[PDB]
Structure 1
């Protein structure tokens, strides 16, 4: 685990304030806006991440060891609304003017000292830095080409940073006559060729990431008991989980500080706090009142013990697509508890995939919990052309419903459509054809929720309106099939409709 550290290093030389492509923002403006976009995305994806903003080549120097021409605007710290507000003072042409006024520009710098200050910035962090990363925004392909000493010292310090564990990524911006990596940045960066335009990576950085993504959390570590004597240890992971609106925090009208809630249970007759031993649970059916202790109410609840109990192997064809009860889980071995689990798990996955059969188990997640029948469907590993794990290898824990969970159906008379009507519905489907992606849609409630909090935080009167992706493109659909729509409607519905 860890809190991630990210340092944004921005060049402030004369070349950075001149825009190349006409009617286009200056490389500096591009950087400032990109940084702001990352900050906002981070206040959504991971708030504990620590960010920092350092400028170089400025006349005014503000830094730990008072290195000339290094202005550390923001130290390594969590993202905040005021930090984004401070960067907004440099956004645009007027913000550029504000920058030149607060601090100078185009001053002689020394990349060696710049990377030392950045490294010294990681030095001052106490919490676990899981990732150390520096993103250098510059449009100078060969800065110390004239100064040989500064260039070699910078190459040496870049090596020292990689040997420390710091990642160095270049965000090359538009340069007259192209940007050359071979001249400089080729050896310093942690691993193309001429790249005259701003690094494509900018489109991704600039694009806002309104996602509440969370560090991998094994939901539970259970025992998969093949038999009384054969027990392997597995980790249950929830690969899909409905992301919900964060709960509000109860504050105070003046101080605006959080208020802790303590929900206390006490007597009416006496007024004092009642002990849990003095309380009992009751259920009244008509006239009879059944009294059970809290322990008894849980004892009837015990049933099976916590863990996975292998029932057998059911062929996948028997598992029906319409028998979904609650969202599926992912089973992966846990070598950390029982050594040799992964080997048996691998053998089981391979032979289950070969035989096209799922492992039926009796799932009991915690103590004093009734069991449920689950089917571990063998999931094979899938890697794309980029060698990225698109589907991890293991078992999908598919929850199967009990007789109680299958609801009775209202018997309707079977009325089958004529082949002309179905072939015609085939034409509508063929025309409304589209490509489905699992990540095709974003939750509009959440998207609006976080757009509202961002706009209120930036004191922007206008709230940022997320376009609802879940609504169908009605007009486009009418354009694609207008006549066909009137034709079927004519074929099935008579004019004397209800």
Structure 2
């Protein structure tokens, strides 16, 4: 369903992060700032529908709607805009840190209960459907000790209250993420890992909803309603927009075919459609064109059953289409969808069917292959139970195959290249490869939105790794070209 996963970062300012443990490593402060930059970046080009906010405590001036001390907001919850990154990023670096020490301040006291309360109030201000609320904490301390334990008590109360409210808490290690000197007080508040939040995943995007609700038709009489899902599809560069030269404003577009005979534009009635074959000018209306295209009503005209044992596996027309039963016209549909899938042992017999995605479109044939549920050991479901539509080829599809059967290789070579290939094996993580192009586009767009020239050219294994795998195997393949004359020359 709809909803937004708004999130807010909370950063400590107690001067502990202002120092990098007197070493080469980045300050905790600046590492956190870089993390925030990374999250904005990964947010803008993933879903410009969330909300984000950043507030610093342990401060000198105090900015907030509630005039509380030691609390310094910077951005109330908003859609992540490039302006946010512009303003934030000038605070990073050693120079940004030292000039931030003065433009705002440098460390102070605070009271954790107050900052928690302020963040809660900040969430309350929003006027949207908030799907997931999260406050993730950036701090270097362990806990307040040189305070009254009443402060700690108030903190515990407020934390429990927020947990009641439905507010989800996270905490990040700053001094030595991985050093494991935290959590002698936070053991009962929250319910490192920030490197993950850093530049590890980017250029993503998400969708939620379903495809057309299409009628499954098994007989002329009885009915059954299902749902269609397309669990994969090519991502394209998002469509451009036509600005001005200089107003940077989208320009309108009135658009018709015109006629020189008169100043009045053409008319949809006046427009006619035709095809030319020399002596033939077949004159048609768009309407009769659609009538030509249409054959029957949208739905799944069931053809019959075919055992999975073999249909083919080398043919492909379109990406597969997941099916999930759903009450669309008829209740208890999942009642008939409860079976056909529990045991595919004899249900593997697939379902040849006639498919019609929408109005008037000439149907194809679809292989309604059942795919039973799998469970991941983390109680995670991927490839949910149901069906995948494999589009079925037609006779006109199988274009000409030139016939060339001449020579089979000698068996002394087949085992030898078996030894060759066996050395290299990649598990094929389906997430291990990426479209370089859209990602490059994204990084470019990030560049122009800010003062970055074009400092992004990283490869993501799209290029061959054999630049090192060549020596990985060594050179056994070279003498393993026992073709005496090299095919190359």
Q: In which range does the TM-score fall when normalised by the shorter chain?
A: over 0.9
Distance in 2 separating the partners of 1:456 and 1:483: 46
Greater helix share, structure number = 1
Are positions 1:256 and 2:226 aligned together? Answer: no
TM-score normalised by structure 2 residue count: 0.93
TM-fit CA distance, 1:80? 2.0
Number of aligned positions between the proteins: 488
Which of residues 465, 468, 473 in structure 2 aligns to 1:473?
465
Sort the Cα spacing of 1:365 and 1:492 in 2 relative to 1 into closer, same or farther, 3 A: farther
Sort the Cα spacing of 1:489 and 1:94 in 2 relative to 1 into closer, same or farther, 3 A: same
TM-fit CA distance, 1:264? 2.3
Sort the Cα spacing of 1:483 and 1:283 in 2 relative to 1 into closer, same or farther, 3 A: same
Sort the Cα spacing of 1:342 and 1:412 in 2 relative to 1 into closer, same or farther, 3 A: same
Distance in 2 separating the partners of 1:478 and 1:34: 37
Distance in 2 separating the partners of 1:476 and 1:433: 14
Sort the Cα spacing of 1:313 and 1:254 in 2 relative to 1 into closer, same or farther, 3 A: same
C-alpha contact (below 8 Å) 1:57/1:109 kept by paired residues: yes
1:265 paired residue number = 257
TM-fit CA distance, 1:365? 0.6
C-alpha contact (below 8 Å) 2:226/2:328 kept by paired residues: no
Moved more, 393-402 or 148-157: 148-157
TM-fit CA distance, 1:179? 5.6
Distance in 2 separating the partners of 1:251 and 1:415: 60
Distance in 2 separating the partners of 1:478 and 1:385: 37
C-alpha contact (below 8 Å) 1:451/1:466 kept by paired residues: no
Sort the Cα spacing of 1:479 and 1:399 in 2 relative to 1 into closer, same or farther, 3 A: same
Sort the Cα spacing of 1:319 and 1:17 in 2 relative to 1 into closer, same or farther, 3 A: same
Sort the Cα spacing of 1:495 and 1:77 in 2 relative to 1 into closer, same or farther, 3 A: closer
C-alpha contact (below 8 Å) 2:17/2:175 kept by paired residues: no
C-alpha contact (below 8 Å) 1:352/1:358 kept by paired residues: no
Greater strand share, structure number = 1
Gaps of at least 5 residues in structure 2 are none
Matched ranges for 1:443-462 at <5 A = 443-462=435-454
Sort the Cα spacing of 1:352 and 1:285 in 2 relative to 1 into closer, same or farther, 3 A: farther
1:200 paired residue number = 192
TM-fit CA distance, 1:180? 6.2
Structure 2 counterpart SS, 1:446: helix
TM-score normalised by structure 1 residue count: 0.92
Structure 2 counterpart SS, 1:149: helix
TM-fit CA distance, 1:401? 0.9
Listed one character per residue, the Cα deviations across residues 80-101 of structure 1 (whole Å, up to 9, x for unaligned) are 2221122222212222112211
C-alpha contact (below 8 Å) 1:3/1:130 kept by paired residues: yes
TM-fit CA distance, 1:336? 5.4
C-alpha contact (below 8 Å) 2:306/2:349 kept by paired residues: yes
Sort the Cα spacing of 1:318 and 1:83 in 2 relative to 1 into closer, same or farther, 3 A: same
**For the aligned residues, what is the CA RMSD?**
2.3
C-alpha contact (below 8 Å) 1:45/1:209 kept by paired residues: no
Listed one character per residue, the Cα deviations across residues 342-397 of structure 1 (whole Å, up to 9, x for unaligned) are 22113122243543222222110101111111112111222222111132111111
Sort the Cα spacing of 1:492 and 1:310 in 2 relative to 1 into closer, same or farther, 3 A: farther
Sort the Cα spacing of 1:348 and 1:495 in 2 relative to 1 into closer, same or farther, 3 A: closer
Distance in 1 separating the partners of 2:232 and 2:82: 30
C-alpha contact (below 8 Å) 1:375/1:400 kept by paired residues: yes
Structure 1 counterpart SS, 2:49: coil
Structure 1 counterpart SS, 2:45: helix
C-alpha contact (below 8 Å) 1:444/1:469 kept by paired residues: no
C-alpha contact (below 8 Å) 2:344/2:372 kept by paired residues: no
Gaps of at least 5 residues in structure 1 are 190-198
TM-fit CA distance, 1:494? 5.0
